[PDB]
Amino acid sequence: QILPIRFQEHLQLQNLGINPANIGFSTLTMESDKFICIREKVGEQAQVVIIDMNDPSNPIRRPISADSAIMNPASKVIALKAGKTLQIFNIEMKSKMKAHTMTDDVTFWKWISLNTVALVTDNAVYHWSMEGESQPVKMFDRHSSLAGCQIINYRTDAKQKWLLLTGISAQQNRVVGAMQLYSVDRKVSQPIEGHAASFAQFKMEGNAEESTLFCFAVRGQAGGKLHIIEVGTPPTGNQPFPKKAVDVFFPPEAQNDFPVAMQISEKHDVVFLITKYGYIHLYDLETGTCIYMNRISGETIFVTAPHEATAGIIGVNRKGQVLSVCVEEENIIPYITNVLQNPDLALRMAVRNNLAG
Amino acid sequence: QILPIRFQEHLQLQNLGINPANIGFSTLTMESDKFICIREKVGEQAQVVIIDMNDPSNPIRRPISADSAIMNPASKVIALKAGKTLQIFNIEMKSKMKAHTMTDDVTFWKWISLNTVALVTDNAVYHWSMEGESQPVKMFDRHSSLAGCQIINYRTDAKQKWLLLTGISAQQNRVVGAMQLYSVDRKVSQPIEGHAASFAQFKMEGNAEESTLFCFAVRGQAGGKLHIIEVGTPPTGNQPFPKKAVDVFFPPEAQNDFPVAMQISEKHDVVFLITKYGYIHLYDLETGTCIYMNRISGETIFVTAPHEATAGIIGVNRKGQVLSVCVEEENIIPYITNVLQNPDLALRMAVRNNLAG
Amino acid sequence: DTNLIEFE
Amino acid sequence: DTNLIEFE
DSSP, rough: OSSSSSEEEEEEEEGHHHHHHHOTTTTTOOSSSSSEEEEOOOTTTEEEEEEEEEEEEEEEEEEEEOSSSOOOOOOOOEEEEETTTTEEETTTTTEEEEEEEEESSSEEEEEEETTTEEEESSSSEEEESSSOOOOEEEEEEEEEEGTTTTEEEEEOOOOEEEEEEEEEEEEEEEEEEEEEEETTTTTTEEEEESEEEEEEOOOOOOOOSSSEEEEEEETTTEEEEEEEEEESSSSSTTOOOOOEEEOOOOOOTOSOOOOOEEEEETTTTTTEETTTSSEEEEEEEETTEEEEEEESSSSOOOOOOETTTTTTTEEEEEEEHHHHHHHHOTTTTHHHIISSOOOHHHHHHHTTTTOOO | OSSSSSEEEEEEEGGOOOOOGSSSSEEEEOOSSSSSEEEEEOOOOOOOEEEEETTTEEEEEBBOOOOOEEOOSSSSEEEEEEEEEEEEETTTTTTEEEEEEOSSOOOEEEOSSSOOOOOOTEEEEEEEEEEOOOOOEEEEOGGGGGGGGGGEEEEEEESOEEEEEEEEEEEEEEEEEEEEEEEETTEEEEEEOOOOEEEEEOOTTOOOEEEEEEEEEEEEEEEEEEEOOOSSSSTTTOOOOOOOOOOOOSSSSSOOEEEEEEEEETTTEEHHHHHHTTTEEEETTTOOOOEEEEEEEEEOOOEEEEEEETTEEEEEEOOEEEEEEEGGGGGGHIIIIIIIIOHHHHHHHHHHHTOOO | HHHHBOOO | OOSSBBBO
16 A cells, blocks of 8 residues: 555675675674775775765775774765774875874774764773864763673764663573663763663744754663653743653564664654664654555664665665655555555544645 | 633642653543543553543552543543444443444544534544443534544533544644534534534523523634534524624734633633633633633643633643633633623623623 | 443 | 775
C-alpha cells in the first residue's frame, strides 16, 4: 500500500572496486552525506579512497599512513591520525592546515560541526576547532561506567552545551550500551544505559524559545525502549517538555539485535532509528508515537549521517550498499490517518510541519 | 493578587497506573465529572478502567472487547460498541439493558442527556433513548461540508431542538473547523466554520421566557472570534437576543493553537473556552466581554465536561492530570472592577448572578 | 448476540 | 614532521 517512508539505494561501493573487507566501522567513514572515506591496504601500500557523493564514478585514491581518516562534513578537508600524531589537510590545495601531538592515543574521533573535531581518549574527551590558531581543549573526564567499552559514538546538542559519549560492551551475554551525558554548564555528568541517541531542537507550541531534546533508544533488561527528554533548564519563559518513553519493538528472529543509529529530521520532527541488523523505525519527536517500522537492510548497518537533501538518514552497510530513508512527504499523513488509524497524530503532523495528507 | 478564576488539580491518572499512551481522545472518555473511562490493552487482553471520581484510588478494571466505551453521566451504566454492534450495561447489576445493531459503523457517539446517546455515522446522526423499548432515531442527514472531517463533538440545546455536529480537518496547513447546525423544528441545517461551541439558556431582562443561545469560537482565516447568537424564533413575547461577536486572542507562540472545548455556566453566565494547547478564556455570556485569559495547562487538553459542583469546567490533558477551573466567586467582581477597570460589567455580574464584590 | 464486557 | 598523506 503506501509507505510512510521513502527508501532509495544511492550506491554499491563494490561496483567501485572497494574490497568488502574494508566496508566496516573502522575503515569506512561517512562524516556526512558528501563523502565516504575508505582506507584500503592495496599491496604493501596503505591508501585512502575518497568518494565524492556528487561524483561516485570517480573515486580518488591517495597514499596514507594514518590509522584513521575522517572527512569534514562540508569541504575536502581531511583529519588523519597515527597514534598521538594528528594532522589536518586541505586535499584540494595540498597543504597541512593544522597539526597536534596528543599525549594519549585517540580511540575515537569525529567531526561534530563544520569546524570542530571531537577527540576521545581512554580517559577524556576533547574538542578541537580549526578556527584560527588553536589546540585541543578537554571537555570532560570520562566516566568509569564506560571503562572498557568500545567507543562507537559521540554527539552534541546544537549549542555544544550537552555532550554524549557512547560505548558498548559484551555483558551478561547481550550487547550492553553505556552512555555518558556531560553538562558543559553544570560541570556534571550522568551515566545512562543506551545504545543510540541524538539531540534535537524543538519548538513546543506556546513556547517562545526552542527546547533542547535528548532522545535515546536502548535495548535493556526490560527490552527495548526509546526516551525523549528535555535536557537542562528550559529557557526562561518556556514550558518544560514532557519526557516521553515508548518501547521499541524487536521481533523474535532479532534475538541479539539492538539500536545502532539515530538521526532526527527537524524538518518533520521525526526520529529515524536503525538497528544493527537493518530494522528502521519511525517515531514522532513530539509524542514518541511509533509511526512505521520494517526492515530496509539484510546486511548490518554500521554508519549513518543525516541525509541533507531529503531531511532523512543515509548509511552504509556491510555489503557496501549506500541506503537512505526519509519521510515520503506525499503520503505520510494518509498513511498515518488510514493505515495507522491515528487521526490526531496525522492531523498534528500535517499542520505542524506544513504537510499535506 | 487575585484571580477571577480558581484552578485546581483533582488527579494524576498516572499515579493510578494508567499508561500515558491511553490518555487521549480515543481511549479516555469523560462524559461527565463522575467518571473517567480508559481503555487499556494490558497484555493481549483489552479491558476498561473505570475511575469513580468519588473514589479515585480504587479504579476497577473489567475485560472488554469494545472499540469504544462511554459512561452515563450519572450512573454506572456504560455504552459499549464494537463496529455496528451496540450494547448498554448496568455495571452494578452486571446486566445487558439494551442492544442494537446499526447498519453503518458509528464514528462518534456521546451521551447528550441523562438518558440519551447520540450516534454519528459517516452520513447521519441518530439519537437513542434508554427509556423503555426504544431504538435509534435518525435526526438528520450529515451535511457534505463535514464529509471527510474527523468528528470530535456533538452538542444539543436544553430542549434538543438544536443539534450541533462538529468536525475538523487539516486544510491549508491549519486545523479548520466544520460545524453543522440542524434545526429539529424547521428540518433545515446550516454550515458554519467553527472549532468549539455550546448552547445555553438565558433569560434576557424584560423577557418572560428564556432564550436559547448558541455560542461558538473559531480561529478562521480572519483570526479567532467568538459568537453568541439566539437560535430559532424568540418565544412569542420575548425580545430577540442581539448577536455578539468578539475576538479571541492567540499569542505569537500559539501558532497553530485553536479552540478545543467550551462549557457555559448558567450559574454565573460565563463561557469557559479552552484552546488545544492549554489556554483558558473567560467571557461574559451576555456581553461577550473577555473577563480573564491566561495559561492553565502546558500539555494539550482533549476532553472536558461541566464541573457540576463548582459550576465550572473540568478536563483532562495528555499528562493525565485532571484539571478544573471555575469562577472564584469571592473575588470575580473586584477583579473585574479593579484589575479590568470595568465597573459596569462588574456591577452587572454582581447583581445578575447574585454575587458579591 | 454476545457480550462485549465480561462482568465479575 | 612527516605527513600522513601524499599528494601529488
